[PDB]
Amino acid sequence: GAMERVLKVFHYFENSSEPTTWASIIRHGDATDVRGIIQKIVDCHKVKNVACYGLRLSHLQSEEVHWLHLDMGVSNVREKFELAHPPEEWKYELRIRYLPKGFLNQFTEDKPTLNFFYQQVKNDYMLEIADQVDQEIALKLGCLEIRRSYGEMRGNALEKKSNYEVLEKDVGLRRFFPKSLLDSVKAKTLRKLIQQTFRQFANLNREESILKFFEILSPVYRFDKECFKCALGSSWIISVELAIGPEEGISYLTDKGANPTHLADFNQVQTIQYSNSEDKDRKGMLQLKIAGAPEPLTVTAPSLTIAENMADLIDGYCRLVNGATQSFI
């Protein structure tokens, strides 16, 4: 390596400041690769479920996402993407990606991870679906974040004017609610609405807020799996939507929402390979060898990147469901 420079690693560990600037500054003195990065950050917050974390590197003016292999070096990852577009244009982001066979009730015994998964999922929701979600769902969730964030106030503190005033004037309600929720109705009505729908969640501790936050979020937001338009077969090729998740392993969708067809679980995987598909075109092959089955499970993805992502994903789950630190690619 040449420079040598900073690398700001944006994370979802709560730091009582501003969730946009939650990041670890990881200087030259650590580590040498990616499995390095993660281990430094997770250990600061004494994480149990280390298997579940991954590093995402995305350009902040495009939607394409790059999951970084565990062993791929620090400098040579930087020196394949970063060095083409002025370095201050990439977002390094630590994320939970590989979920256990019952994540909520497991993250429970691991405070640091539960808050992390909460924050991450909360941020997706606030960034993607909060504005065209059913508005009282938006109400229930924001109140729940208030209830969580300020664990020390009695459940009827917002009843007092000066307390609501603190949330409205100083911290800003946009921190809990989507722009549309606040602009839709009069401010005095907004005040009454918040206090009232708060009444049902007034009594809950931090965990219970989080759990009910998920409970209320799950029937309207996908966060328990990832889905991929792709193809299957090594000669005859069929378009399918792939669901990859803890509760149905690797499955396909048709479409939707018929009981998804389970293909393979994560313990049944042996190897993972990916190519530039040649043939030709910049598409990506993916090939899974599965215990018992003779011919491998081929997957044709629209781009190389998508396969490199699908790989990381099954790669991540194979590691977790086994007990391995060595990848399966």
């Binding site: 009582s16 200087r27 300020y150 020390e152 106030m153 000066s162 307390n163 603190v166 949330l167």
Partner: protein, 257 residues
Amino acid sequence: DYEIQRERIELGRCIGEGQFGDVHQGIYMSPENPALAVAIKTCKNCTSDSVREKFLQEALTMRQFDHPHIVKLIGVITENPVWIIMELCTLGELRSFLQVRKYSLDLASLILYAYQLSTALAYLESKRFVHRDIAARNVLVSSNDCVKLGDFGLLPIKWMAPESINFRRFTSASDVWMFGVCMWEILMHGVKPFQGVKNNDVIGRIENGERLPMPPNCPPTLYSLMTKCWAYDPSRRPRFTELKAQLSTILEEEKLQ
């Protein structure tokens, strides 16, 4: 430049515990004139860029302040182990000062400290700086007739404004809240607010309109002044600048026999 050569500092006895590292008393051979008596703040986790970055900040903010009742920053030794050299308040912590001298200190002196404290705090608001922990235990005594505010680094539930407990907001107005408790501690001769009261109850009591009693022998105008600092609604509390002038006539009143 506030940089000091370690040769010119003799480290002495230890005098406090912060949460970066111990506070020491020492000697500083300036060529200014003779051997100055300093307090030396030290750091335990010097072997890390992050801790140092912040530890040094304390010194770097303190630079911006120059005031008769805020401990001066004399300088910094920026090499491991990092030290912040500042002036020694020889007569020590206010609580211990008052306790020892319960029956030898007049009301006027007590009101004097409160006032000096408020010049400090008014000074700081004029600089937009929020203390976050005004309390007797953070006040050092330089002389009989002179106290100074110390710190300045980033839970004291019994001292905190409701909004600091509820929503973790710290402002000038929360400062004024803590200053009130502080005057109370002074006027009670370093006796802690809510002794025998669990933190979690204290929060409820205050929530219910309850306040600290009027300390015996405290003069009513002043206790009236403290109660204003404990308005629940932050906007109803006086600014430090008005406390200052209030405390001034209150003192001149007591002094004027």
